[PDB]
Amino acid sequence: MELIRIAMKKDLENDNSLMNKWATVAGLKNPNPLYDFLNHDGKTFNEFSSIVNIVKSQYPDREYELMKDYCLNLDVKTKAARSALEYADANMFFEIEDVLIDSMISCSNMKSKEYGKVYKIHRELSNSVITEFEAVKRLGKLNIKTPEMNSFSRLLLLYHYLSTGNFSPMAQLIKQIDLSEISENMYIRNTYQTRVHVLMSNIKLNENSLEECREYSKKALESTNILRFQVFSYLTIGNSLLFSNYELAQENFLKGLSISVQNENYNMIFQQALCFLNNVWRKENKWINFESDSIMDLQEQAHCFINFNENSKAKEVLDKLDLLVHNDNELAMHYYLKGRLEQNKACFYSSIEYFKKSNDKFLIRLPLLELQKMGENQKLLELLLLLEHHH
C-alpha cells in the first residue's frame, strides 16, 4: 500500500463522517470511487484533482511526504502518472518530477512517453543544460500529438524568456496557447490555466499595464490551491505596486513571506522583493543579503549604498558586479546603478538601451526618472519613452 491509503483507512476507522466530507472534497460527488480507491490497488480517480484535494484537506502538513509516495508508486503508463508529472512540475517537486520523467521516456505508452520527453526538455532548458535553440529543435523532432504538450511546449519557452529577461517574444507566444483544446485531463487544463494567468500577469507587468497585471494575478489566486502559483501571484502584485503604493506592495510581499515559512526559496524571493522595494523608496534597508554573490542581491547592496551616499562601498560592489556575466535586463539595472553613482547621463542611455532590448517597460521608469531629474530635454524624454527596440 501507499501512505495516503493507510492514513485514510485509519482515520476512517476512527471517524466515518469523514467519507462524506472527502466525497465533497474530492469532487467525487459519490463516495463510490473513494471506496474503490481505498480497497483496490491501482484504482485512480478519473481526475488527479481528487486525491490532491483530499491530501490538502486532511493532511496539509504531509502533502509532499504523501504525494511523493503516491506519485512514485503510480503506473507510469497511466493518466494519473501524467497528471502527477504536471502536479510535480507545478509544485517544483523536482524529485517526483525527474524520476517520473526518466521512467516515462522509457515506457511503452505513447502519451506518457510524449509528456515525459517534453517535460524533460523543459527541465534541461531550465537548468541551462541545453540552449533554447536545441530545445526548439528537439520539440520539433518530437512531432507532438497531444494538445496538452502542444500547450506546454509553448509554456516552457515562456518560462525561459521570463527567466532570461527576454520579454519581447512573450505576448505573441502566450496568445498561441489554446487550453480549450485540452479535453481529456481536466487537472492539467486547470493547472495550465493558472500557469497562463501568472505568466500573463508578468507580461502585463513588463508592458507597464499595472491594473491588468493585478487582474491576472487575482485570477491566478482564485484558480488555484498550489503554493508555487500563490507565491508568484503575490510577488507580481507587489511588484506592480512598487512605484506607487509602498504599504500595499509591502503587504503583498509580507503575505508571501507568511505563506513561505517552510520554503526557503520562496522566502528568499520575498526578501529580495522587499529589498528592492525599500531601495526604490530610498528607505533604510533591512532586507539586503550580504552573503550572496548573485547579481540580484549585489545590485541591491549597491543600490542601498548609493541611496545613502556611501559611494566607496557602492563602487566596491559594482566592481564585484563587473566580474559577473549579465543578461540584458540585469545589464540595464547595472547601467542604472552606474549612472546614479557617477551622475553620468550616458549610463542612463545605456540602461535605457538594455531595458528596450529586454522589452521591460516597467523598470525603465528608473533611468527615465533620473534623466528627468538631471534636466533632460522634454521632447527627448518623450522620444526615449515611446521609441522601441527592433527585435
Binding site: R195, L199, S201, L235, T236, N239, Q272, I295, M296
Partner: peptide, 6 residues
C-alpha cells in the same frame, strides 16, 4: 534587481 517569477 527586482525578483520576477511565474
Amino acid at each position: 534587481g527586482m525578483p520576477r517569477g511565474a
